[PDB]
Structures are given as C-alpha cells and as structure tokens.
Amino acid sequence: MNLVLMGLPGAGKGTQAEKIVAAYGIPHISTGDMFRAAMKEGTPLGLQAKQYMDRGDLVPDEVTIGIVRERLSKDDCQNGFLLDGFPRTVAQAEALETMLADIGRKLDYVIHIDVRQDVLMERLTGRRICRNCGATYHLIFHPPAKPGVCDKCGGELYQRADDNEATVANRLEVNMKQMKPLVDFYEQKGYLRNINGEQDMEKVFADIRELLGGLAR
Numbered sequence: 585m586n587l588v589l590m591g592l593p594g595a596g597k598g599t600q601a602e603k604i605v606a607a608y609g610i611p612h613i614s615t616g617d618m619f620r621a622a623m624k625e626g627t628p629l630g631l632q633a634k635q636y637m638d639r640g641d642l643v644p645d646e647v648t649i650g651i652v653r654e655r656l657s658k659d660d661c662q663n664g665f666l667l668d669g670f671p672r673t674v675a676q677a678e679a680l681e682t683m684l685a686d687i688g689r690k691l692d693y694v695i696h697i698d699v700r701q702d703v704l705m706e707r708l709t710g711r712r713i714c715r716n717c718g719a720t721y722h723l724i725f726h727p728p729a730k731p732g733v734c735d736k737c738g739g740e741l742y743q744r745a746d747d748n749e750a751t752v753a754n755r756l757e758v759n760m761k762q763m764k765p766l767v768d769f770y771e772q773k774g775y776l777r778n779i780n781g782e783q784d785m786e787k788v789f790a791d792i793r794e795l796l797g798g799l800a801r
C-alpha cells in the first residue's frame with residue numbers, strides 16, 4: 585500500500601499519519617521530520633533547510649526530491665509506505681511518479697485532508713509540543729492537564745519556531761500556491777481522495793480507514 589498524505593500546514597497530516605502507520609505497520613516518511621533531523625545533526629542539508637524552514641518557505645525541489653529518492657530505496661518500504669508532506673509541488677509529484685516506477689511501484693491513493701484557512705491558522709498558532717518527548721498538544725483543541733507541562737513526561741511545552749502567526753501566514757500562502765494545483769494533477773490520474781479534516785480526530789481517522797478498507801476489498 586503506497587500512500588500520500590497531502591494538505592495545507594495544520595490540516596492534521598502528522599496526527600493522522602501516526603494512527604495510520606500504527607494500524608498497518610508501514611513506514612512514515614515525513615519530509616518535514618527528515619529536514620528537522622538533518623538540522624539537529626548539523627549536516628549540509630540541515631543547515632540549508634533551516635533557512636527556508638525558519639521563514640516558512642519551501643526547501644528547493646532538487647534537494648527535497650533527492651532525500652526522498654534515497655529514503656524510498658530502502659528495503660523497509662517493500663510492504664508499502666506513507667509519504668507525509670511530499671509531494672507539495674508539481675515538480676515533486678512528477679519526480680515521484682518516476683522514482684516509484686523505477687522501483688516497480690505505483691501510488692494507490694493521494695489523501696487530501698481539506699480544512700479552511702482560518703481554522704488552519706488556529707491549528708498551528710495554538711500547537712504546543714513537549715521538548716522532552718515530542719508529544720503534541722493544542723491550547724484550544726486539546727490542552728494538557730496543567731498549563732505548560734507535558735502529561736506524558738512532565739516536560740516543558742514550547743511553540744515550534746515556525747508556528748508564530750507571521751510565519752504561519754507565509755506558510756499557508758506558499759503551500760496554497762504550490763500544493764493546490766496537485767488536487768487537479770491527482771484527480772486526473774484517479775489517485776485523489778478528499779477527506780474533511782474539520783472533524784474530530786477519530787472521525788477523520790474513521791473516514792480514512794473506510795477509504796483504505798476498499799483496497800482489501
């Protein structure tokens with residue numbers, strides 16, 4: 585099962601991805617996470633990605649396509665995979681068709697999680713993450729028991745560098761311009777499936793699971 589989760593920042597891609605991989609046992613490939621990992625490690629790519637990420641801009645296509653190509657070549661992707669946040673430009677989608685064909689694979693579904701921009705703004709600015717264990721909370725939608733403290737480990741909660749209002753405004757704009765044309769691109773190939781992301785988390789997951797059940801039918 586080869587899947588793509590696509591959506592504007594804050595739509596709930598990572599949230600749903602965790603639930604999906606836990607049910608199927610397939611790898612979760614997130615370009616955002618890979619870039620953050622390179623940043624922490626201090627590699628040449630992490631230093632380059634940092635500048636774009638901090639501004640809410642997209643990292644150049646050539647660079648992004650390369651790290652994905654390398655990741656998809658591993659044996660752990662033999663039973664399927666879930667691409668989260670890639671592709672997000674037409675150039676990236678065209679490259680993906682080719683990269684997959686090269687390893688003898690074709691996409692099953694491109695799940696587009698749709699949410700209105702005003703809601704997305706709130707989704708991101710209110711997000712708080714645990715500095716210790718990485719658990720995610722939301723000040724409005726799902727707050728911790730005690731303010732500023734992680735329920736899981738007692739760690740400090742903080743706001744991601746790119747989740748401030750100004751950076752979020754730029755992220756939404758560039759992703760809207762680059763990613764939205766992908767809806768049409770994938771509708772044409774028949775891979776696209778829309779999911780209403782303005783529902784409670786379990787309901788969004790149920791809609792996805794229902795969609796995925798059809799692959800086994």
Ligand SMILES: Nc1ncnc2c1ncn2[C@@H]1O[C@H](COP(=O)(O)OP(=O)(O)OP(=O)(O)OP(=O)(O)OP(=O)(O)OC[C@H]2O[C@@H](n3cnc4c(N)ncnc43)[C@H](O)[C@@H]2O)[C@@H](O)[C@H]1O
Nearest residue numbers: 593594595596597598599615616637642643669711722785
């Ligand atoms: N392909 C690519 N090409 C070029 N550059 C690339 C690239 N990929 C990455 N990059 C670069 O890397 C940067 C970062 O990329 P990335 O980290 O991938 O940024 P993103 O796409 O903006 O996604 P987000 O993590 O911010 O949101 P999400 O939808 O996963 O949200 P979550 O599930 O936490 O949910 C958000 C919040 O809402 C809450 N929530 C989730 N679902 C619900 C729900 N149903 N109801 C209420 N609250 C909910 C969550 O708890 C949370 O607080 C990019 O800006 C770019 O610089």
Ligand SMILES: [Zn+2]
Nearest residue numbers: 714717734737
């Ligand atoms: Zn924690």
